[PDB]
Amino acid sequence: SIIDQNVQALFNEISADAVFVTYDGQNIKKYGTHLDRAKTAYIPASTFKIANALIGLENHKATSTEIFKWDGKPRFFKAWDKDFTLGEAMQASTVPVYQELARRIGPSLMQSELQRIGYGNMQIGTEVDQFWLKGPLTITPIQEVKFVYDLAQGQLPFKPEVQQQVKEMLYVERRGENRLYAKSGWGMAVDPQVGWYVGFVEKADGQVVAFALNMQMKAGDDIALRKQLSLDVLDKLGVFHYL
Numbered sequence: 001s002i003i004d005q006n007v008q009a010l011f012n013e014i015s016a017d018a019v020f021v022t023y024d025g026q027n028i029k030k031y032g033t034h035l036d037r038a039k040t041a042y043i044p045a046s047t048f049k050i051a052n053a054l055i056g057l058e059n060h061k062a063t064s065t066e067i068f069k070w071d072g073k074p075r076f077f078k079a080w081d082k083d084f085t086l087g088e089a090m091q092a093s094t095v096p097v098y099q100e101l102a103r104r105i106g107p108s109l110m111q112s113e114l115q116r117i118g119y120g121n122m123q124i125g126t127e128v129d130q131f132w133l134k135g136p137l138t139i140t141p142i143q144e145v146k147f148v149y150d151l152a153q154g155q156l157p158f159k160p161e162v163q164q165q166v167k168e169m170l171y172v173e174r175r176g177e178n179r180l181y182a183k184s185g186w187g188m189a190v191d192p193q194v195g196w197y198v199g200f201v202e203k204a205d206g207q208v209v210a211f212a213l214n215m216q217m218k219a220g221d222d223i224a225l226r227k228q229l230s231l232d233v234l235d236k237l238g239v240f241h242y243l
């Protein structure tokens with residue numbers, strides 16, 4: 001109860017509309033400045049890389065050790081003018097690498113797969129390398145936590161080793177034997193801009209707590225806030241304490 005209060009007091013800083021959803025395989029809990037956001041579907045943005053990677057590896061469109069060579073065309077961030085493996089690109093949010101992946105998957109296979117796994121509204125439109133960045137694909141924060149919780153538990157409808165590979169692409173840090181897995185997202189090409197920070201905390205016992213920060217974004221917002229806010233919540237909840 002007071003834990004739940006200590007979490008809300010963090011959201012007093014946050015002028016933006018936000019929601020923080022947690023899941024432990026039984027109960028969904030909601031926190032933030034605007035709770036209806038948990039039931040609302042938004043474009044997945046870079047959080048789709050999780051599903052994309054899974055779909056690609058499952059269908060032999062790539063390997064986890066394969067290197068996606070840079071084409072020489074300067075990308076949106078100078079950081080992306082480089083060669084990447086799916087894991088390195090996952091950490092760096094290298095959009096062009098996953099665009100290449102989506103193109104290799106193709107629109108037919110991408111459609112059937114998203115339908116098979118029930119990922120959000122399962123709509124891709126006509127551009128197989130754009131749907132997650134500008135719609136029509138949408139997904140709710142509740143759908144994100146249930147999806148990412150299953151990845152943690154190896155319960156998604158994919159090969160164990162495929163789920164394993166994508167899981168470790170999301171690894172951030174550990175404290176004791178509690179491990180933090182996460183993925184950030186910023187739907188920059190839509191009004192309103194959507195900000196994501198989706199993941200889970202794996203406690204060595206075997207118990208997992210999946211999480212999903214979903215908030216309103218604006219031009220010029222601090223890129224580090226989403227993660228930082230999420231860690232501040234995970235600390236106050238007792239799921240992932242600071243040192």
Ligand SMILES: *C(=O)[C@H](CO)[C@@H]1N[C@@H](C(=O)O)C(C)(C)S1
Nearest residue numbers: 045046093095184185186187188
């Ligand atoms: C994916 O959500 C975007 C591409 O539009 C990339 N990821 C962002 C993020 O996770 O913070 C970015 C601002 C690095 S760009």
